[PDB]
Amino acid sequence: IFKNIQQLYIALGMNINPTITQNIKDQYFKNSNWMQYASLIPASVGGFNYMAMSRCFVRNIGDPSVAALADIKRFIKANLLDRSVLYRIMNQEPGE
């Protein structure tokens, strides 16, 4: 988690990609808890967290979505995330 946070900050502030504008950068740097949410929400549902908690015990976890939602519930119980985060994840817009 610590290295993910550091890498997100590096990618958003000190990278050679010229397409990263300023509005995105200060939107993530100034909105409260946004970097924490980005580093903590699992990647299967939108976030940038790629390590499931059950991956520390078994190699094959099944399908990623169930593990991601179980991890989100565990985060909510541990006060790492709020319930509104789960509601937003459930009500996000679909692709095409």
Which residues in 34-93 contact other proteins (CB under 8 A)?
34-40, 45-48, 52-54, 57-58, 61-63, 65-67, 69-70, 73-80, 83-84, 86-93
Instruction: Identify which of residues 11 and 50 has a Cβ nearer to other proteins in the complex.
Output: 11
Q: Which residues, at least 6 apart from 92, have a Cβ–Cβ distance to it below 8 Å?
A: 45, 46
DSSP state of 92: P
Q: What is residue 42's three-state secondary structure?
A: strand
Q: Which helix (H) or strand (E) holds 15?
A: none
> Considering CB under 8 A, how many residues would be counted as binding other proteins?
71
Q: Provide, rounded to whole angstroms, the least separation between the CB of residue 84 and other proteins.
A: 6
